[PDB]
Write a protein that binds this ligand. Structure first.
Ligand SMILES: Nc1ncnc2c1ncn2[C@H]1C[C@H](O)[C@@H](COP(=O)(O)OP(=O)(O)OP(=O)(O)O)O1
Ligand SMILES: [Mg+2]
Ligand SMILES: [Mg+2]
Length: 539
DNA sequence: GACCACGGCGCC
DNA sequence: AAAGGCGCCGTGGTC
């Protein structure tokens, strides 16, 4: 491959080396580009960044985020990772993709640029005549990479001093709990070691082991086990409380304040575009899609995510999105009329679980009801239904005679979905995103049945993901116009930041864009709230 | 220091 | 522990 002096012509493919994976923290070690049988290697990569008009190549978005960090608008364009991921969503890393589609992912920018060029050639050919995947690439994934780059580079503000104070308070409560556990154990041990805990609970104390761990067959110490032991010894309660606190402390309270960026004063996640089997995004480095919210301490942590001075957070959450998608994908009339009319199913379940009027339902009672209706839907055991409801098997089985009894075409839809996955080797979303599920004709029931659950979940979860992504693509230019920002995506929700004076307008526009993204046989409802913090913006 | 598997658990 | 999708923790082990 011919070496030519740096600058490349327009439309060249880029290769780059980062000192580390996170583009907001990374030093740009090298930059190169490829076109027309020439490779161009940058003498000094930061300065060489100014010459490009767009990031075109493997991991295009990551380079674009680093460009934005440096005050440059270098939007991501074609990325062979996105083409390969649409073909087969197990194409998630560039190591894998290079080997599969015609090269080797090295640690050299020039080779990486050449690799991008020839991988795009090959992958663009594989998507010839794959009209619906091409639509997803042009209308969702490629434009979405730009949106996510802005989200990544913008970050979210975090109340740091508040989290530091919270840390010292939770440290004292943890100390209280561990001292009481050690007394009840009759000795101190490492309470964070589940192996040590196993021996204390089941050998030294006499408590009955319920279940076993999956890979190594040890006696389980999980919450589900411990809940069934909640009055068989006073120690179990303390352990459950200790687990809650140390999880939140070790994962959220302590690490997040140390991740504030020195230039932005904000906390920056990565939104991974080729990481799931269904077409959802993921978030990492720090994961901001699992910030807690259920428990009171969880809520305290969520209040730490705050609007910039003079701005408000706007949180928009789709209501019962997968259930509405199912009504559409299947065509079940009784499910369609429930949404056409305007009933609630999470609240319907909660008021019958807890045995209270509907007016007496609240947020945390609906939390319980989400394990039940989703859980039950995607192939839950009658037996486990009994456990989390905490009732007999006779009442848990008859619920899956009622949750299903009314809806003939859901069953027919699952079965149709499974038979097509067996035939074609893949299942698909409403827009034709594929997941290959090979184990549907496996000869071992438990493997076959796990594969089935995965297979009929994907059109549902994947369609909801497609809708949210499309909604993000259309919403983004409208917010830039209003001087507003998109901060986070959490599967079925978005969090925006709007100047105080334009917040209510932003809220109304965003809602309307999300409700009418792609009309279905049933309406999409979005709940919206505005606030100084992430918690209060939903309440 | 790094990587990994595992159990465990946060969110959707 | 009991018939969906993730990423990150501490442990325990390894190199
Ligand atoms: N426990 C779960 N198991 C499987 N899927 C889940 C679970 N919790 C949530 N999801 C999926 C299904 C939801 O439609 C989707 C979005 O989550 P979420 O907002 O919490 O519930 P929801 O959209 O159905 O109700 P709502 O928004 O009205 O409170 O993610
Ligand atoms: Mg939600
Ligand atoms: Mg695991």
């Amino acid at each position: 491959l011919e070496e030519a002096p740096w600058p490349p012509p327009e439309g060249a493919f880029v290769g780059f080396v980062l000192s580390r994976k996170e583009p907001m923290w990374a030093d740009l070690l090298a930059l190169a580009a490829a076109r027309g049988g020439r490779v161009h290697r940058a003498p000094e990569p930061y300065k060489a960044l100014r010459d490009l008009k767009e990031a075109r190549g493997l991991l295009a978005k990551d380079l674009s985020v680093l460009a934005l960090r440096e005050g440059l608008g270098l939007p991501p364009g074609d990325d062979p990772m996105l083409l390969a991921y649409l073909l087969d969503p197990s194409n998630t890393t560039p190591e894998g993709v290079a080997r599969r589609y015609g090269g080797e992912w090295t640690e050299e920018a020039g080779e990486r640029a050449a690799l991008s060029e020839r991988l795009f050639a090959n992958l663009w050919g594989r998507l010839e005549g794959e009209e619906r995947l091409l639509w997803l690439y042009r209308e969702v994934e490629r434009p979405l990479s730009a949106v996510l780059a802005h989200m990544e580079a913008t970050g979210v503000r975090l109340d740091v001093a508040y989290l530091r104070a919270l840390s010292l308070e939770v440290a004292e409560e943890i100390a209280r709990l561990e001292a009481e556990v050690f007394r009840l154990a009759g000795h101190p041990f490492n309470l964070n070691s589940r192996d040590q805990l196993e021996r204390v609970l089941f050998d030294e104390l006499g408590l009955p082991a319920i279940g076993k761990t999956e890979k190594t067959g040890k006696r389980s110490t999980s919450a589900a086990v411990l809940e069934a032991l909640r009055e068989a010894h006073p120690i179990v309660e303390k352990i459950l409380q200790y687990r809650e606190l140390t999880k939140l402390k070790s994962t959220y309270i302590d690490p997040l304040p140390d991740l504030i960026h020195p230039r932005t004063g904000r906390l920056h996640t990565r939104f991974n575009q080729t990481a799931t089997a269904t077409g959802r995004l993921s978030s990492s480095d720090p994961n901001l899609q699992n910030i807690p919210v259920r428990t009171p301490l969880g809520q305290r942590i969520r209040r730490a995510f705050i609007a910039e001075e003079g701005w408000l957070l706007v949180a928009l959450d789709y209501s019962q999105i997968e259930l509405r998608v199912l009504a559409h994908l299947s065509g079940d009339e009784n499910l369609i009329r429930v949404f056409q009319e305007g009933r609630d199913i999470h609240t319907e379940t909660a008021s019958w679980m807890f045995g209270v009027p509907r007016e007496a339902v609240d947020p945390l009672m609906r939390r319980a009801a989400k394990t039940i209706n989703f859980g039950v839907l995607y192939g839950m055991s009658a037996h486990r239904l009994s456990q989390e409801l905490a009732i007999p098997y006779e009442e848990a089985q008859a619920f899956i005679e009622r949750y299903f009894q009314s809806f003939p075409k859901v069953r027919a839809w699952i079965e149709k979905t499974l038979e097509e996955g067996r035939r074609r080797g893949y299942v698909e979303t409403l827009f034709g995103r594929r997941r290959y599920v090979p184990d549907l004709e496996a000869r071992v029931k438990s493997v076959r049945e796990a594969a089935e659950r995965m297979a009929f979940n994907m059109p549902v979860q994947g369609t909801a993901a497609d809708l949210m992504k499309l909604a993000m693509v259309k919403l983004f230019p409208r917010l830039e116009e209003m001087g507003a920002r998109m901060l986070l995506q959490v599967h079925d929700e978005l969090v925006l930041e709007a100047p105080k004076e334009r917040a209510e307008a932003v809220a109304r526009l965003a809602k309307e864009v999300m409700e009418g993204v792609y009309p279905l046989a049933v309406p999409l409802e979005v709940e919206v709230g505005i606030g100084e913090d992430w918690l209060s913006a939903k309440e």
